[PDB]
């Protein structure tokens, strides 16, 4: 309802714009500016703004709020997100979102925070013209997470974004970083087959020379992510060896990077680092982006744990309240703790179709071997001698002969620590349950202490961290 | 009297029987006047699994409430408020401090019986501010705790307990200190760990004179049941068996008495017989476990451990028979029992001697430091990652 649309827009445009411009302009306060802009602003634009009041688009006023390019060609993108093709799956404005130049009414009022059109328009060797361009470009493509829109204003958005960029600056890469994430997503996330790649690589080259960490970080994640979805995995594996993640990247950037890296090492046969990277991503960044990811992360995570050699408990399923999403997985877990082969194959097959989706399919075969490995550890540990035939029946192996061969391999790996006596008709337990006997109580301390060293370093550094900014702000 | 309300909410939760329990749950709240709140309380009862309320869209409407009860309670609660406002008008005419407090505090408890939490807090609040008897002060704060235990919201339980806990010790009343132990005792069965609960109950039978509590006999029957779960033969033997008090009183216990006796005789044939039946019998009727897995798992470790500790070798037949279940089931159970490190036995089925190495040693205590440290260790990393952003 246009008479009601105008209050909503004016407030929204001013509030979001004010925070991006007041922060950017200071230009030498790089750490604060980088953090505020990446996490807070983009997140504000997604979750609070859109949802607030009647009609999710508050875009038409906004285009005029700052400046993109002076003819109404670049503006046109603002109309296209509103209506063309699909029209997204957001609530669009009735009118006053005009094809060419959305709005007739400025909210600019010659501010430094809401700009002025000819005033920004002079800039092209100043950071004032590239920053404004980007903020508006970002806002327009911000609807894409929520909507999962295709071929509206995202047809020329890739090209238009390259135009905004030039040889950039360290301040300009920090604002531009927000745009880089959406640039891949429009063809990536939908999985239209197109080249998002050219641009992504190209910004990457430029940002490394200037050495702006925010920019490089975003590109590397997308490049891995794009490949895996396209089903061109080979490309993603080779990429990692050439990558370097900055150590001064922000918390969202790290979470996305870590999840994506985690799926890759899991394929290689490295479960140990794969589980840790996926868990930490969820706490590191609670984002509204994060909501789409979480179901996949837990689903993939469980199959990934079973392979490492831990069998997860029931409780873990219960707490994140996503138990239902987890539910077909939960059955696979109950099957490993019992250790019986026969149950695993049936369950995993019917369910298997769903599993293909997460990225689990490659792994799925290997989960067969964990079930038996858990059965072998229980047989050797519990008793001394039980007949080979009793074991054959219990796990539901095909033959009593089949039990021998599997037991024989397991000992070599050395996880079991038993002896199988083939001729005598039994397994002998060579192991005894202990952790104080050999050199081993020291190892037991080692692992306990080891997890701690990391926690200590983090607690202490983190404590100091707000005071580091106050110290810089000039307080003792 | 009110402690049964708390036990009854607990029964639909038991994974051993969902449906029968619903009929147990209804009975006492219908008498007391929980009807009015019950529309809001019903959502908590769904998590616990099924409710037979008139507005319930749950499976069992086989013992569905009649519409007239909901309405009768509601008129009654408004009528009670109408009398109260008027009491309040009268109060200024006498003493401000005495008359307004007595009425405000009485209104809170009434609100608490219904299970209206919000109305309780406000009504109580004024009375705390004003001078009132120390013993009375401890009973009213327990009622706020009592509403939460019915409601089965876990976070809620914590707040009340900590506050009450300071006021009891400060005070001179020993008898009242005991009352808090029972309420907290319900809390202990409510969470997974049953072990914690037994101790509160052993104290409370001695001292917690009847008022806000059932009859002496129904309380003693709870007392022995819970003592058996935590305590092994030395502990059980000294505490219960030694006493003068049981002989003087005279038994009315025999079913539960057999379950306590079997452990002492160290014949697991008698134990296991009493265990399949007792589990079903006691647990269903009154809550000591909303999570049935914990109860049997802990009892079976003790029954096997205790047989093994005393006797190195046994025949398979004796082993199968005494324990109860299949040889197959027994052999799987053991593997889990071994992992703990307190059991450490080997079984030869091919030579039919089950040997028990049984190391009482430093390794047992060592094992414990290493094991416990794990939960905490994982948990800080998670706290620290939250605090920093």
């Amino acid at each position: 309802p246009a008479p009601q649309d105008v209050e909503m827009k004016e407030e929204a445009a001013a509030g979001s714009g004010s925070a991006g411009e007041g922060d950017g302009k200071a230009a030498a306060t790089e750490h604060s500016q980088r953090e505020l802009d990446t996490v807070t602003l983009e997140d504000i634009k997604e979750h609070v703004r859109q949802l607030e009041k009647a009609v999710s688009g508050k875009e038409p006023r906004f285009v005029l709020r700052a400046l993109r390019m002076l003819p109404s060609t670049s503006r046109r993108l603002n109309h296209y997100v509103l209506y063309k093709a699909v029209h997204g799956f957001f609530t669009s404005n009735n009118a006053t979102r005009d094809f060419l130049l959305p709005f007739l009414e400025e909210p600019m009022d010659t501010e430094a925070d809401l700009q002025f059109r000819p005033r920004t328009g002079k800039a092209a060797s100043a950071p004032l013209l590239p920053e404004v361009e980007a903020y508006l470009q970002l806002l327009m493509v911000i609807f894409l997470m929520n909507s999962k829109r295709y071929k509206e204003a995202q047809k020329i958005s890739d090209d238009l974004m390259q135009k905004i960029s030039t040889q950039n600056r360290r301040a300009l890469d920090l604002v531009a970083a927000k745009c880089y994430y959406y640039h891949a997503r429009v063809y990536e996330f939908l999985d239209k087959l197109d080249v998002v790649r050219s641009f992504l690589h190209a910004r990457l080259r430029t940002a490394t020379l200037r050495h702006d960490a925010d920019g490089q970080a975003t590109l590397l994640n997308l490049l891995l992510r794009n490949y895996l979805h396209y089903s061109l995995y080979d490309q993603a594996e080779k990429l990692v060896s050439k990558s370097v993640f900055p150590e001064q990247a922000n918390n969202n950037e790290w979470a996305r990077y870590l999840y994506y890296t985690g799926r890759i090492k899991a394929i290689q046969l490295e479960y140990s680092e794969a589980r840790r990277t996926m868990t930490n991503a969820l706490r590191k960044a609670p984002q509204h982006t994060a909501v789409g990811f979480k179901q996949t992360v837990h689903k993939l995570l469980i199959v990934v744990e079973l392979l490492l050699g831990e069998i997860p408990d029931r409780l873990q399923f219960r707490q994140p309240s996503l138990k239902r999403s987890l539910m077909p997985y939960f059955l696979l877990t109950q099957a490993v703790r019992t250790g019986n082969l026969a149950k695993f194959n049936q369950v995993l097959d019917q369910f298997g179709e769903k599993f293909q989706t997460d990225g689990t399919y490659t792994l799925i075969i290997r989960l067969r071997h964990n079930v038996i490995k858990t059965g072998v550890r229980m047989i050797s540990l519990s008793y001394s001698r039980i007949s080979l035939a009793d074991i054959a029946q219990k796990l539901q192996l095909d033959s009593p002969e089949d039990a021998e061969f599997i037991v024989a391999k397991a000992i070599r790996d050395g996880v079991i620590e038993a002896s199988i006596n083939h001729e005598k008709g039994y397994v002998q337990s060579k192991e005894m349950i202990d952790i104080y006997s050999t050199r081993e109580p020291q190892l037991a301390f080692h692992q306990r202490i080891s997890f701690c060293l990391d926690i200590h370093n983090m607690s202490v550094k983190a404590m100091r961290f707000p005071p580091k900014s106050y110290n810089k702000d000039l307080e003792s | 009297m009110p402690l049964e309300n708390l036990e009854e909410e607990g029964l639909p939760k038991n994974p051993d029987l969902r449906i029968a329990q619903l009929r147990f749950l209804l009975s006492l709240p219908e008498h007391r006047g929980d009807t009015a709140v019950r529309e809001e309380l019903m959502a908590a009862v769904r998590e616990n699994n099924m409710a037979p309320y008139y507005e319930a869209l749950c499976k069992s409407l086989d013992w569905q409430m009649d519409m007239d009860l909901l309405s009768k309670m509601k008129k009654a609660n408004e009528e009670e408020l109408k009398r109260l406002d008027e009491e309040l008008e009268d109060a200024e005419k006498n003493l401000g401090e005495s008359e307004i407090r007595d009425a405000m505090m009485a209104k809170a408890e009434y609100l608490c019986q219904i299970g209206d939490k919000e109305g309780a807090l406000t009504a109580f609040r004024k009375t705390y501010d004003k001078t009132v008897a120390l013993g009375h002060r401890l009973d009213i704060v327990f009622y706020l705790l009592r509403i939460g235990l019915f409601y089965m919201d876990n976070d809620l339980i914590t707040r009340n307990t900590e506050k009450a806990k300071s006021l009891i010790e400060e005070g001179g009343d020993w008898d009242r200190r005991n009352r808090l132990k029972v309420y907290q005792g319900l809390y202990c069965v409510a969470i997974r760990d049953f072990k914690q609960a037994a101790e509160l109950f052993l104290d409370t039978v001695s001292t917690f004179t009847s008022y806000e509590l059932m009859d002496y006999k129904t309380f003693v029957t709870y007392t022995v049941y819970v003592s058996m779960i935590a305590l092994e033969r030395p502990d059980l033997r000294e505490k219960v068996i030694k006493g003068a008090e049981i002989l003087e009183v005279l038994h009315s216990l025999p079913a539960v008495r057999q379950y306590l006796f079997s452990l002492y005789e160290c014949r697991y044939s008698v134990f296991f017989q009493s265990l399949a039946v007792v589990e079903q019998e006691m647990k269903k009727d009154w809550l000591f476990a909303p999570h049935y897995r914990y109860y049997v798992r802990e009892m079976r470790i003790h029954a096997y451990s205790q047989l093994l500790e005393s006797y190195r070798s046994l025949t398979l037949g004796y082993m199968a028979e005494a324990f109860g279940v299949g040889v197959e089931f027994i052999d799987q159970e053991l593997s889990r029992f071994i992992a703990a490190g307190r059991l450490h036995c080997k079984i030869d089925k091919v030579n039919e001697i089950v040997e028990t190495n049984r190391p009482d040693s430093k390794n047992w205590q060592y094992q414990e430091t290493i094991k416990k440290g794990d939960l905490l260790l994982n948990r800080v990393q998670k706290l620290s990652r939250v605090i920093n952003m």
């Binding site: - | 051993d16 039946v277 279940v325």
Partner: peptide
């Protein structure tokens, strides 16, 4: 872990009675 409680009560009473006859 797995739900041992549902299975043990039924098994313990029944199996034990047959075991009495079978073995000492």
């Amino acid at each position: 872990n797995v739900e041992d409680d549902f299975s043990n009560q039924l098994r313990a009473e029944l199996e034990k009675h047959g075991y009495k006859m079978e073995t000492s």
